[PDB]
């Protein structure tokens, strides 16, 4: 019973640590200053983005600053670059969820396809405070105000993620809780087009029991925290769907802003 659920929780946490370089613990230490590392470079405008380019991981044909003469598109390109790597991290993590790699490979694909952005948005909250988001493994802090100032639809992308994060961060989960929660998101048996749902739901039932136990043990003073966290899963879907519509605006109105093929594959026929 609960014996293996504690082992599962620990296995997931260890895998999470292996898969995600910038944990919530590291990010909070940076965001609160409880680190001996130098303060992240604060990107709050065109000029600061130009000077902080060296802190935004970006490997391309030319430097980030030369991607466009326009700030919004530089941000778009750097964020796309990060998302591709985020997807790869989440995929590695997923493969460590017990049972996951034994599922139909086409179902593994489907679970990843519909789960990765929900997980990205969940984990982005770990990197956020009310005023901005850590970027490039905490190498840069991009202000919420700056992101909101970008011309439409560029300035509409991050604000719903900040609004989600402020409420989600109020739950005060830590990495050990998050490791099980994002496993629960991945193992969702109601993703469209799943070929064989029972094995997925069976895994998710175990993950849900380990999450509930983990939350009770780790947050004894937070009654119904499980119930509160479960109610956020549905918010993530709305964020994804709203993000899709914004990407659709980019696609219908901007030239030369095709997505990385991995993102195109994820988004193709999404919902």
């Amino acid at each position: 019973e609960s014996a293996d659920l504690r082992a599962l929780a620990k296995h997931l946490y260890d895998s999470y640590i292996k898969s995600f370089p910038l944990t919530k613990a590291k990010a909070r230490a940076i965001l609160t200053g409880k680190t001996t590392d130098k303060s992240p470079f604060v990107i709050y405008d065109m000029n600061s983005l130009m000077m902080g380019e060296d802190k935004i991981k970006f490997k391309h044909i030319t430097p980030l600053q030369e991607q466009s003469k326009e700030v919004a598109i530089r941000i778009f390109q750097g964020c796309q670059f990060r998302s591709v790597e985020a997807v790869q991290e989440i995929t590695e993590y997923a493969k460590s969820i017990p049972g996951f790699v034994n599922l139909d490979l086409n179902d593994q694909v489907t679970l990843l396809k519909y789960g990765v952005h929900e997980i990205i948005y969940t984990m982005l909250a770990s990197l956020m405070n009310k005023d901005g988001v850590l970027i490039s493994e905490g190498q840069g802090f991009m202000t919420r105000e700056f992101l909101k100032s970008l011309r439409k639809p560029f300035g509409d992308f991050m604000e719903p993620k900040f609004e989600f994060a402020v409420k989600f961060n109020a739950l005060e989960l830590d990495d050990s809780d998050l490791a099980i929660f994002i496993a629960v998101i991945i193992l969702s048996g109601d993703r469209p087009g799943l070929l064989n749902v029972k094995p997925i739901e069976d895994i998710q039932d175990n993950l849900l029991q380990a999450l509930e136990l983990q939350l009770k043990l780790n947050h004894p003073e937070s009654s119904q925290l499980f119930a509160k966290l479960l109610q956020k899963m549905t918010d993530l879907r709305q964020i994804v769907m709203e993000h899709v519509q914004l990407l659709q605006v980019i696609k219908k109105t901007e030239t030369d802003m095709s997505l990385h093929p991995l993102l195109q594959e994820i988004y193709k026929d999404l919902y």
């Binding site: 997807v87 790869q88 995929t91 997923a94 493969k95 790699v101 490979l105 593994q108 694909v109 990843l112 396809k113 093929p261 991995l262 594959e265 994820i266």
Partner: peptide
């Protein structure tokens, strides 16, 4: 057309 997600899922380690 070959799935990039499949490539990532089949990659070892």
């Amino acid at each position: 057309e070959p799935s990039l997600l499949k490539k990532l899922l089949l990659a070892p380690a």
